[PDB]
Write a protein that binds this DNA or RNA. Structure first.
Ligand SMILES: Nc1ccn([C@H]2CC[C@@H](COP(=O)(O)OP(=O)(O)OP(=O)(O)O)O2)c(=O)n1
Ligand SMILES: [Ca+2]
Ligand SMILES: [Ca+2]
Ligand SMILES: [Ca+2]
Length: 342
DNA sequence: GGGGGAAGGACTA
DNA sequence: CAGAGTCCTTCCCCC
């Protein structure tokens, strides 16, 4: 099994560059303006010109302006990025029918039947890079290896505009000299939780008795890390299928007033249904982000598809159930639809 | 003692 | 200051 991972570089900021080359060289910060207070909002993405100084995704726009007051700030234009992505994703499609689109800027190729050593995998990946660049002026990063996880890791180390391979040899080394916190799927909450157990490297998992691991990080994850270090990660590249679509929005001011929230909830619904394509969902979940940034949600599943009018009706009941069963003020509200009729 | 569905939360990209 | 989607886990109904 020879996986070829592709990952566009700071996609949103780069797409803004391709559309406006004058931005090339200058730090670019694509952000989401919440509309609460002037420059309120968060940073969605930024090019390396800004990354170098600490301006990264997740930080407050204000903060970003205190670090790079002269950097260029652009509002996020998801729709554009999405179309550019689609075009690229189609290019990749021509290099293997076995392709898994993980996200708007990530794809996993299973070139096992496409190549034989790793020398061409590298070369193949080279063609993919010179292809995407030649057609969309977008630089990406390729990470080749024996499985999705390591492929990604390879890519993580080679970004930006790179391409790294991981010989079964290095796979062995990494399982020993790589901080388990650089391993896909292991986040701060599991990173520390692991450290407490003394595990700092992937192989350190092979020691600890099982039930102790699948006791503090759950069975599933426990295995995942094990099978990975024990060099047995299987997981094939299967075509991903969107299982849920939805939209959440930030209100101008925290409220607990049903009549003050409805309008935000409905706008979120209109957008979701639009994005729903022709998909008919049987389940709808109203999601709310509290004042303390807590996330609560009430949903429901029907024995039939959901009509926009029913979405409007059921979403309001669920929102009420939320306000009944909770006291905190709501900051962000939204909806999400799933279980699409096939 | 699990299958299946609801609500939480971890991580993601 | 703090802006989409998948999977895993827990608690509960039910066979
Ligand atoms: N707090 C955060 C963190 C990340 N993201 C988004 C930013 C784009 C996507 C992927 O992030 P990275 O892959 O880390 O960066 P990138 O811009 O996608 O490109 P690169 O992979 O080269 O860093 O996740 C986000 O919306 N909010
Ligand atoms: Ca990327
Ligand atoms: Ca990590
Ligand atoms: Ca990443």
């Amino acid at each position: 099994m020879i996986v070829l991972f592709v990952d566009f570089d700071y996609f949103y900021a780069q797409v803004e560059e391709v559309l406006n080359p004058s931005l090339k060289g200058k730090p670019v910060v694509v952000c989401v303006f919440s509309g609460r207070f002037e420059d309120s909002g968060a940073v969605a993405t930024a090019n390396y010109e800004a990354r170098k100084f600490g301006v990264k995704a997740g930080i407050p726009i204000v903060e970003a302006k205190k670090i790079l007051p002269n950097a260029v700030y652009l509002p996020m234009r998801k729709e554009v990025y999405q179309q550019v992505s689609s075009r690229i994703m189609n290019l990749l499609r021509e290099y293997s029918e076995k392709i898994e689109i993980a996200s708007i800027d990530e794809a996993y190729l299973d070139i096992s039947d496409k190549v034989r050593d790793y020398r061409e995998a590298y070369n193949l990946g080279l063609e993919i890079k010179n292809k995407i660049l030649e057609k969309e002026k977008i630089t990406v990063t390729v990470g080749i290896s024996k499985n999705k996880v390591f492929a990604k890791i390879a890519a993580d180390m080679a970004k930006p505009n790179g391409i790294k391979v991981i010989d079964d040899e290095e796979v062995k080394r990494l399982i020993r000299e790589l901080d388990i916190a650089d391993v896909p799927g292991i986040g701060n909450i599991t990173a520390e939780k692991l450290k407490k157990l003394g595990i700092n490297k992937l192989v350190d998992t092979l020691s600890i008795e099982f039930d102790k691991l699948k006791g503090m990080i759950g069975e599933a994850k426990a295995k995942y890390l094990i099978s990975l270090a024990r060099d047995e990660y299987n997981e094939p590249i299967r075509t991903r299928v969107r299982k849920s679509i939805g939209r959440i929005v930030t209100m101008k001011r925290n409220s607990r007033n049903l009549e003050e929230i409805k309008p935000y909830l409905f706008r979120a619904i209109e957008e979701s249904y639009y994005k729903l394509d022709k998909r008919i969902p049987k389940a709808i979940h109203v999601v709310a982000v509290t004042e303390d940034l807590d996330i609560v949600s009430r949903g429901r599943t029907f024995p039939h598809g959901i009509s926009k009018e029913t979405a409007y009706s059921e979403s309001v009941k669920l929102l009420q159930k939320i306000l009944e069963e909770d006291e905190r003020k709501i900051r962000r509200i939204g909806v999400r639809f799933s279980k699409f009729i096939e």
